[PDB]
Ligand binder design. Structure first.
Ligand code: HEA
Ligand code: HEA
Ligand SMILES: [Cu+2]
Ligand SMILES: [Cu+2]
Ligand SMILES: [Cu+2]
Ligand SMILES: [Mg+2]
Ligand SMILES: [Zn+2]
Lengths: 514, 56, 43, 261, 75, 43, 98, 227, 84, 47
């Protein structure tokens, strides 16, 4: 019974719930790791020890938050939960395969946990670049385990990418065109395509790294005629699409949240919005090298990559401005989710603006490998991707559970986290302009002030993720059942009540062919 | 040759309230349990090895 | 040989494994006392 | 409600995803044992449960489609998409390896002798067996097509005959390639040339074996009358995969065997 | 001579080949002036350049390779 | 979004309890390990 | 060439596959594979929404190029109207279901 | 070097670093414009009881907000690219120094004439003489002539490392088997600090760079007394 | 190096079966002969301890950890030199 | 499908007793947050 339901599932709703549960827990581990990082940097000196134990921590932080919290939650959680409901499908195209996608995750996570236990773990950076990641500077099972964890997580994500594209394309009502599906669905259909094309190149890269250190190959070893830079190309070819794969579903949720709380029927410029994500997804494939400005490449190619990278601002701009245009004549409701949506719009703008700066190779020479880049991506990840997750979570919680959250508490939670993340990452812009490198367990005396303030902010964030856990408990402890939902005419996900039954759309949906 | 898909269609369409991976008999069941056993055991064995390798 | 094999027989085999499975465990226990493996003793 | 009125398939709870996920764990960690604490028992168990899972997972799929009739037109169109997409991810997997190769051969490091093929490497002759392997794969391309056409025309014997010829050519290539490996005057350990060569042609080799067991499966399904002149996706896929395989060999031949040697 | 001057055939951030080429060139010229005599003329220019640009360790190992005859370049 | 009153309301005391517990469960284990860092760094 | 031997759908198709196969040749569509064609939608010529129960979700693409489908439950009883454009829809019992 | 409570870039010791400061100011001016524009529009949208929830025509305004960002990007790109080429410019150096990253120290090689080569290691915070910088002082500074175009060639003898000196606006990764080139040109004497800008193991944070720039005369006497 | 040839506008199974036995298979036979004729056994290449070859940074997970998988002693030397 | 439906029933954990739930959530998120701390400890106690 429990087994059949929870271990042998073929239900998009239950698999989606299983994901959210996996993502939340992984989110705890990643938070703990981020605290050890700021604990180590909150006072001049060494708390843990050498850059090895420290960088092992920094590496797990990245893998956990990227592959085990953000991706599972947005794509597996909201993806599986909402997609079928938004297009009127009974389930997904491949219910069984969908389950394997999920179950591949816990093992993948185990391998990553195991890696930091055996030997001295993997202090290579999330980019696990060779020669440091090689069998000399990093002998032992650790890196190998890190590689296998990544293989599984990749197999999991492209299998799911296959499911979402097939479902989304093949399972909509016969009269509904693609230009009739909601932005969130478009958002995951496009993210699914990026995963399908980038993930395999990564697997090609790390498999080459695996043979280099166990089978005596020399793909990245100069001795045999290899090239450590070749790994950089392969990794980053996936590495960039990967960050868009991380923000796109967030773009979608934001479009849904802003529109709903503005009391609007639809988002402003729907086709412009579809065009924008498609452009973003595409340009995202031809700019990888901006991560290699100080590697010794030709000035000309270095010029190409700074330009190519900059044009991504245009489409992203039409999206920011569209969400604003959406708020326009709206009847605004200051709900928790709307608060998260507004924060995202601003904070993400700042963080992406800061990324345009780094787009310049000349300036990037002095900005690369410093805390400026740590600020850039935490703005777009800690107050971009994450803010979307929170807005979507508080907005759809009633649909998933049937129960409601205490809005006041939910608002308190935003206030605390908003202060925390800004205090944590704002100072870091300075540390980076002033020269503080990345991946250091200690720094020259001058960087003491900002690092201190920065670490204090991380403690406020800790407070907020603790409160959230409680906020979820209370919701489930009180049991206020949902009664009425607004704007369902334009929001299908809610039409079957909270929570929708195990089997929805048993009998299709009627859509006329005008 | 044969052609008896018609017999199997009937066997598998039979309303015995059994899941497809068991709808076919007793062997389905032994195969299932063997597979399940090896997997769980293996998983246990793997955890042991990791606990073992964690130490110097 | 061929006669013994049958589509119908499977339930008996499944039942046999448990009794057989239970029987198998006893031998390990029985052998172990006589065998006295230090590792077995350690277990 | 109660009785569905959509043409889709609601698959029964299967333990297979869990079983195959556990399998991946066992094989990956098992490789880690083999590579480090010199043990294969774990790797052996994983390979085992894995075959078990694939057999059963695919057995059920056959049950649900051929015996139970769940593969309505809508369900099939979805399987077509899935296969295409899968083949795509594969095309991009091989692309990492051609990138690697071209990267190395187009800009040979001084430690190689500043040339390509590196000094000390004696490349095979494309005009010898590589040329043979090429013609074998290409012929199975025409014969698998003949098979497909017989099937649609309900010609049982001929489809079987063509599918058989196709399968043996695939095996012939496997053996031929196997001998080439053994006679090759260079190894995986011979710098970047050997790496580049053995892993690209090697992964492809694995794919020819994966494609051949697939066609074999198709062969037997046909012996058992599973396929109708009009519904035989299992074959369509086997066929698409088989072509992906010739094509990859054409690039290998031209790039590694001819140009980069 | 101050230091190896700018070389048009090696105009980018990567000078690896610059070091490599001149090391070859020198030793190739050397071998010839030897096996020809021609008043044992000498190609110093190449050595000045390769010594400036090539890190010691490379030159060393290459020399050793040339010693045991495992040097991959054609001289 | 409207909802029925709580089927099983959580009074302030009840909340104060759940909030305290939630905090401790996060702060204790970490605090302990962190409290003994030096002992580890000195074996 | 020459010969025969492979089964046909008409003779070997089973389950739901067969059901839609036959149903399709009679011109009917019980498993909603096709897009329902609209009526004039007037109070007198409502769009007839077949259903296997007493309510079905109707999605109304008000104007041809609309990107937003208006959704709502159509109940057994008097004709109902799309909230954004009138357009009458009336539930009807679903015949063929096998 | 960096001082306490610093906000922006370290003071430019060389001309391209000056050039960068000005470009950054330009770029930063724009990010301030846009980021404040967005914030104003947002607060504007959320501050009225007036509603208009019916349909709104897009596209029309959609050109303004697509052509504008396009013009602004050129305004950044142009200056950026110019400085970019200016860096990879045809110059003729009067000296060539090599540096080789090693697992936890850099070694330098001045070999134009004589085979001079030494190791540069960080001074343990324990053996620092009063007034010496905690994690920045090295035992052997890399001495070079001020006011002269030097050609640095960066490589490594093990894992990847990155040789950087912010005041001069330099940063070049050190990749084994590779010779990356960079032009150093200080326009003023002094001590200029930098740090390894690439994760390389346990002591990644403890392998600094200290440039000491004196006049040619003192440079050559130093060079000789060094062997 | 060809261009193309004999068009037979109607392609059914008979056409593909025709190409199989009238083109595909005959080619496999020719090339087989060709490769059976050019079967010149190359004398094992001269051994010279080049450093970019016979790489060994970690002993192989099998045998004496110094023998590559499809090791052919006749044509593959160990790092030290030919097997025997 | 004998799968129960409705609030509190579409989840793999019991939500019927708020305090048993409290315990479960506490162990769940708690064990997740503590893991990194104990891993660092483990690494600090090796040689
Ligand atoms: C979801 C996460 C995310 C997102 C969306 C982005 C978006 C962008 N990032 Fe990225 N970035 C990261 C996460 C992300 N990044 C990470 C993880 C790293 C570090 C990885 C590592 O090395 O470890 C990184 C690193 C990184 C680098 C290299 C730094 C270095 O190591 O030297 C660069 C440089 O090009 C860069 C640029 C950009 C750009 C141009 C965008 C653009 O998408 C920004 C677009 C947004 C806007 C431009 C604002 C909105 C638009 C307007 C308001 C229009 C008007 C504005 C203008 C005309 C400018 N990023
Ligand atoms: C998803 C991406 C993500 C997120 C969200 C964060 C969040 C945090 N990270 Fe970051 N970090 C990375 C990804 C992420 N990080 C990456 C890729 C690197 C590069 C590593 C490398 O250099 O190799 C990095 C590097 C990095 C550094 C640089 C270390 C160095 O280079 O020396 C620092 C230091 O401050 C740091 C700190 C933090 C902090 C303080 C938080 C805090 O903001 C955390 C706040 C807590 C949360 C926001 C999580 C709460 C959310 C949930 C738990 C979801 C709950 C679930 C439900 C509601 C269902 N991170
Ligand atoms: Cu990028
Ligand atoms: Cu370093
Ligand atoms: Cu370093
Ligand atoms: Mg770097
Ligand atoms: Zn309507």
């Amino acid at each position: 019974m429990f087994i059949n339901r929870w271990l042998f599932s073929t239900n998009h709703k239950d698999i989606g719930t299983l994901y959210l549960l996996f993502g939340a827990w992984a989110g705890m581990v990643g938070t703990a790791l981020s605290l050890l990082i700021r604990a180590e940097l909150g006072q001049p000196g060494t708390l843990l020890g050498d850059d090895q134990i420290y960088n092992v921590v920094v590496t797990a932080h990245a893998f956990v938050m990227i592959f085990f919290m953000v991706m599972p939650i947005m794509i597996g959680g909201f993806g599986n939960w909402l997609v079928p409901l938004m297009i009127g499908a009974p389930d997904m195209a491949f219910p069984r395969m969908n389950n394997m996608s999920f179950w591949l995750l816990p093992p993948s996570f185990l391998l990553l946990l195991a890696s930091s236990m055996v030997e001295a773990g993997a202090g290579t950076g999330w980019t696990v670049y060779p020669p440091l990641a090689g069998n000399l500077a990093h002998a032992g099972a650790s890196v190998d385990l890190t590689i296998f964890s990544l293989h599984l997580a990749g197999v999991s994500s492209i299998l799911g990418a296959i499911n979402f594209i097939t479902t989304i394309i093949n399972m909509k009502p016969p009269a509904m065109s693609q230009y009739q599906t909601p932005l969130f669905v478009w958002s995951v259909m496009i993210t699914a395509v990026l995963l399908l094309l980038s993930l395999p190149v990564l697997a090609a890269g790390i498999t080459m790294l695996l043979t280099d250190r166990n089978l005596n190959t020399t793909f990245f070893d100069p001795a045999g005629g290899g090239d450590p830079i070749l790994y950089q190309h392969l990794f980053w070819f996936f590495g960039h699409p990967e960050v868009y794969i991380l923000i796109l579903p967030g773009f979608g949720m934001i479009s849904h949240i802003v529109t709903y709380y503005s009391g609007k029927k639809e988002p402003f410029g729907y086709m412009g919005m579809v065009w924008a994500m498609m452009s973003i997804g595409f340009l995202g494939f031809i700019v990888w090298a901006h991560h290699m400005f100080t590697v010794g490449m030709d000035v000309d190619t270095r010029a190409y990559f700074t330009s190519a990278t900059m044009i991504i601002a245009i489409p992203t701009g039409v999206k920011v401005f569209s969400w604003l245009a959406t708020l326009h004549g709206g009847n605004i409701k200051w709900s928790p989710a709307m608060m998260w949506a507004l924060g995202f719009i601003f904070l993400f703008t700042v963080g992406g603006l800061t990324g345009i700066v780094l787009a310049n190779s000349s300036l990037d020479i002095v900005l690369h490998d410093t805390y400026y880049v740590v600020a850039h991506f935490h703005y777009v990840l800690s107050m971009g991707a994450v803010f979307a997750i929170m807005g979507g979570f508080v907005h759809w919680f009633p649909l998933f559970s049937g129960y409601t959250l205490n809005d006041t508490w939910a608002k308190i939670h935003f206030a605390i986290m908003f202060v925390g993340v800004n205090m944590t990452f704002f100072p870091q812009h300075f540390l980076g302009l002033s020269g503080m490198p990345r991946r250091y367990s200690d720094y020259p005396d001058a960087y003491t002030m900002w690092n201190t303030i920065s670490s204090m902010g991380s403690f406020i964030s800790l407070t907020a993720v603790m409160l959230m856990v409680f906020i979820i408990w209370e919701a489930f402890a009180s049991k206020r059942e949902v009664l009425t939902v607004d704007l369902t005419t334009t929001n299908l996900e809610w039409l079957n009540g909270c929570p929708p039954p195990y089997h929805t759309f048993e009998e299709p949906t009627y859509v006329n062919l005008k | 040759f044969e052609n008896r898909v018609a017999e199997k269609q009937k066997l598998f369409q039979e309303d015995n309230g059994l899941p497809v991976h068991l709808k076919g008999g007793a062997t389905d069941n032994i195969l299932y349990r063997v597979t399940m056993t090896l997997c769980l055991g293996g998983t246990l064995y793997s955890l042991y090895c990791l606990g073992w390798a964690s130490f110097p | 040989l061929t006669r013994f094999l049958g589509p119908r027989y499977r339930q008996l085999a499944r039942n046999w494994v448990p009794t057989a499975s239970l029987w198998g465990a006893v031998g390990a226990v029985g052998l172990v006392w006589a065998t006295d493996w230090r590792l077995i003793l350690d277990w | 409600m109660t009785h569905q009125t959509h043409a889709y398939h609601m698959v029964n709870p299967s333990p297979w995803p869990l079983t195959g996920a556990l399998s991946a764990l066992l094989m990956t960690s098992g490789l880690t044992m083999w590579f480090h604490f010199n043990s294969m028992t774990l790797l052996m168990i994983g390979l085992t449960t894995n075959m078990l899972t694939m057999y059963q997972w695919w057995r059920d799929v056959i049950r649900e489609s051929t015996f139970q009739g769940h593969h309505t037109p809508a369900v099939q169109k979805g399987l077509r998409y899935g296969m295409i997409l899968f083949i795509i991810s594969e095309v991009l997997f091989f692309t990492g390896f051609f990138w690697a190769f071209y990267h190395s051969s187009l800009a040979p490091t001084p430690e190689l002798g500043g040339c390509w093929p590196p000094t000390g490497i004696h490349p095979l002759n494309p005009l010898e067996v590589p040329l043979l392997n090429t013609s074998v794969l290409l012929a199975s391309g025409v014969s698998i097509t003949w098979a497909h056409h017989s099937l649609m025309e309900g010609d049982r014997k001929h489809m079987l005959q063509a599918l058989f010829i196709t399968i043996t050519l695939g095996v012939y290539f496997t053996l031929l390639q196997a001998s080439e490996y053994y006679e090759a005057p260079f190894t995986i350990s011979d710098g970047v040339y050997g790496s580049t060569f053995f892993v690209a042609t090697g992964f492809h080799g694995l794919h020819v074996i994966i494609g051949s067991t697939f066609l074999i499966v198709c062969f037997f399904r046909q012996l058992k009358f599973h396929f109708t002149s009009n519904h035989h996706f299992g074959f369509e896929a086997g066929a698409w995969y088989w072509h992906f395989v010739d094509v990859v060999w054409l690039f290998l031949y031209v790039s590694i065997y001819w140009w980069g040697s | 001579y101050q230091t190896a001057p700018f070389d048009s055939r090696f105009p980018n951030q990567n000078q690896t080949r610059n070091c490599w080429q001149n090391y070859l060139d020198f030793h190739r010229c050397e071998k010839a002036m030897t096996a020809k005599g021609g008043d044992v003329s000498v190609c110093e220019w190449y050595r000045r350049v390769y010594k400036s640009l090539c890190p010691i360790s490379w030159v060393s190992t290459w020399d050793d390779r040339r010693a045991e005859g495992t040097f991959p370049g054609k001289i | 979004i409207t909802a029925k009153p709580a089927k099983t309301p959580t009074s302030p005391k009840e909340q104060a309890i759940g909030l305290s517990v939630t905090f401790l469960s996060f702060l204790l284990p970490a605090g302990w390990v962190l409290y003994h860092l030096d002992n580890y760094k000195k074996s | 060439a020459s010969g025969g031997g492979v089964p046909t759908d008409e003779e070997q198709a089973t389950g739901l596959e067969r059901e839609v196969m036959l149903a399709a040749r009679k011109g009917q569509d019980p498993y909603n594979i096709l897009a329902p064609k609209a009526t004039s939608g007037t109070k007198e010529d409502p769009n007839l929404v077949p259903s296997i129960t007493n309510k079905r979700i109707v999605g109304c693409i008000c104007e041809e190029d609309n990107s937003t489908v208006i959704w709502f439950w159509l109940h057994k009883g008097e004709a109902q109207r799309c909230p954004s454009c009138g357009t009458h829809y009336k539930l009807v019992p679903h015949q063929l279901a096998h | 070097m960096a001082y306490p409570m610093q906000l922006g870039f370290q003071d430019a010791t060389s001309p391209i670093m000056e050039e960068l400061l000005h470009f950054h100011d330009h770029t930063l001016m724009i990010v301030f414009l846009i980021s404040s524009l967005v914030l104003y529009i947002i607060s504007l949208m959320l501050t009225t009881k007036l509603t208009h929830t019916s349909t709104m025509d897009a596209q029309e305004v959609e050109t303004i907000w697509t052509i504008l960002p396009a013009i602004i990007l050129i305004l950044i790109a142009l200056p950026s690219l110019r400085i970019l080429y200016m860096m990879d410019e045809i110059n003729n150096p009067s000296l060539t120094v090599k540096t080789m990253g090693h697992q936890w120290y850099w070694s330098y090689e001045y070999t134009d004439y004589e085979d001079l080569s030494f190791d540069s290691y960080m001074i343990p915070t324990s053996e620092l003489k009063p007034g010496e910088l905690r994690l920045l002082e090295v035992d052997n500074r890399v001495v070079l002539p001020m006011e002269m175009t030097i050609r640095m060639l960066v490589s490594s003898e093990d894992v990847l490392h990155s040789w950087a000196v912010p005041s001069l606006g330099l940063k070049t990764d050190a990749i084994p088997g590779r010779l990356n080139q960079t032009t150093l040109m200080s326009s003023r004497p002094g001590l200029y600090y930098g740090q390894c800008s690439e994760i390389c193991g346990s002591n990644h944070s403890f392998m600094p760079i200290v440039l000491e720039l004196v006049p040619l005369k003192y440079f050559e006497k130093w060079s000789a007394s060094m062997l | 190096a060809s261009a193309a040839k004999g068009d037979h506008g109607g392609t059914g199974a008979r056409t593909w079966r025709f190409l199989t036995f009238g083109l595909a298979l005959p080619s496999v036979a020719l090339c087989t002969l060709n490769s059976w004729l050019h079967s010149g056994h190359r004398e094992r290449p001269a051994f010279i301890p080049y450093h970019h070859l016979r790489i060994r940074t970690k002993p192989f997970s099998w045998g004496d950890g110094n023998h590559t998988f499809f090791h052919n002693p006749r044509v593959n030397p160990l790092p030290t030199g030919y097997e025997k | 499908s004998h799968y129960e439906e409705g609030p509190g029933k579409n989840i793999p954990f019991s939500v019927e007793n708020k305090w048993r739930l409290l315990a479960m959530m506490t162990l769940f998120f708690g064990s997740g947050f503590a893991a990194p701390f104990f891993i660092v400890r483990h690494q600090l106690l090796k040689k």
